[PDB]
């Protein structure tokens, strides 16, 4: 419990790095975006967000979205 | 304190949806969200991808075991 | 989550413990061991293997009193257990040599269920 | 979660409960707590696509429940006056 998970998040917010979110209920689609805001539930507001569909190597542009935190399995930088 | 004994240890994590990653546990909070460093995604293909330092949410972890 | 590791007796929050308890997952008896029903986890350590299993209560979808063939605890995990070298739901049983412990394990498990 | 108080009045009622994973439980309610953890006795449980398992008692986590099929003669109006 040295590194705090929210510290990564504040870091992403601060840095505007592009992140990718693996989702809880489905494995064939991930979300990517830049974090501009969040809350204590890890609900995230993402700018320039996209669905990434691995099987077809395709993407869908979403613009600005609020992603519900209970869908987040894993958050990584890309 | 349960996860404390796993700090700085290489772990294998089974995640919901048949997903599997391995990495070093660097941190956690009261909700068992984890920070895993040097994270490697083990693709169903058998390929391993380096995904870096990640946050994993506690509810998505099905199974956790140390590789050390 | 479920942790696979050596399971020592907890220093805090232990409600009930008993020895000579067989853990069965699906059709397979994993071995005989000691169960620890504690505030945060249901856990079991095999006498004959190095690592046991520790399970957060939120993952025990339900639990009850059954017999397989002898009076025993039944519980269900909400996923499939892949315990390497060892074993969308998994049916589990705790099978004590002494059936007098079953009613007590059941109450202790229900008390922990209510805490989470 | 105020409606849970309704279920808490169901002691001794025989019900069928469908779980979110498709398991059906048939049994007699011995109690329900404020989290909707549901305790039953004299239980027949049918996992999706499996034969029924028989249990002396069962306790179900509230969040695994989809719905209760209630007895046809249960007086809803009465049970619902708080």
């Amino acid at each position: 419990v040295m590194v705090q998970p929210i510290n990564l998040i504040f870091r992403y917010l601060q840095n505007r790095s592009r992140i990718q979110v693996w989702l809880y209920e489905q494995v064939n689609m991930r979300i990517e975006g830049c974090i501009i805001g969040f809350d204590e539930y890890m609900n995230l507001v993402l700018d320039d967000a996209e669905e990434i569909h691995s099987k077809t190597k395709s993407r869908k542009q979403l613009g600005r979205i609020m992603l519900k935190g209970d869908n987040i399995t894993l958050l990584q930088s890309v | 304190p349960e996860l404390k004994k796993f700090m700085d240890k290489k772990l294998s994590l089974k995640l919901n949806g048949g997903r599997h990653v391995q990495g070093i546990l660097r941190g956690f909070d009261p909700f068992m969200n984890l920070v895993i460093d040097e994270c490697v995604e083990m693709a169903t293909s058998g390929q391993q991808n380096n995904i870096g330092m990640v946050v994993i949410r506690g509810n998505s972890i099905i199974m956790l075991e140390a590789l050390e | 989550m479920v942790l696979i590791m050596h399971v020592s007796p907890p220093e805090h929050g232990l409600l009930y413990t008993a020895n000579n308890i067989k853990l069965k997952l699906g059709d397979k008896v994993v071995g005989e061991g000691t169960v620890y029903i504690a505030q945060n986890t249901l856990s079991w350590q095999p006498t004959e293997l190095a690592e046991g299993i520790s399970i957060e209560w939120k993952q025990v979808s339900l639990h009850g009193i059954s017999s397989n063939p002898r009076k025993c605890i039944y519980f269900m995990l909400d996923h499939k257990v892949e315990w390497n070298g060892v074993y969308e739901v998994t049916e589990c049983w705790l099978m004590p040599e002494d059936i007098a412990t079953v009613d007590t394990m059941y109450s202790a498990m229900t008390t922990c269920q209510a805490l989470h | 979660m105020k409606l849970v108080r309704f279920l808490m009045k169901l002691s001794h009622e025989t019900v069928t409960i469908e779980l979110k994973n498709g398991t059906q439980v048939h049994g007699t309610i011995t109690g329900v707590d404020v989290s909707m953890n549901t305790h039953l006795k004299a239980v027949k449980m049918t996992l999706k696509n499996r034969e029924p398992v028989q249990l002396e008692t069962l306790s179900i986590r509230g969040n695994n429940i989809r719905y209760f099929i209630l007895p046809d003669s249960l007086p809803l109006d009465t049970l619902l006056v708080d």
């Binding site: - | - | - | 979660m1 105020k2 409606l3 849970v4 309704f6 279920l7 979110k20 498709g22 909707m36 509230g62 969040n63 429940i65 989809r66 719905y67 209760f68 099929i69 209630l70 007895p71 046809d72 249960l74 809803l76 619902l80």
Partner: protein
């Protein structure tokens, strides 16, 4: 008030007008019935429920039901 003007007003109006709602549940099941009572988590006591699914349409009748709110996906104010 929150029941009157918030998203739950969908249920409020069903109970007051004694009209049926159509509820999409998990696993492609739908429930058509009347809401006798509900709470802020969308737990419900329902009556005269038609449960509908496909495998080819299938249905069955449940006279009295308690539905746990977190099983609900969507509730339609008008069935059909």
């Amino acid at each position: 008030e929150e029941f009157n003007t918030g998203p739950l007003s969908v249920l409020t109006q069903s109970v007051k007008n004694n009209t049926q709602v159509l509820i999409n549940c998990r696993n492609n099941k739908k429930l058509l019935g009347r809401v006798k009572a509900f709470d802020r988590h969308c737990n419900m006591v329902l009556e005269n429920v038609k449960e509908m699914w496909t495998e080819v349409n299938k249905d069955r009748y449940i006279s009295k039901m308690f539905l746990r709110g977190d099983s609900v996906i969507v509730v339609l104010r008008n069935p059909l």
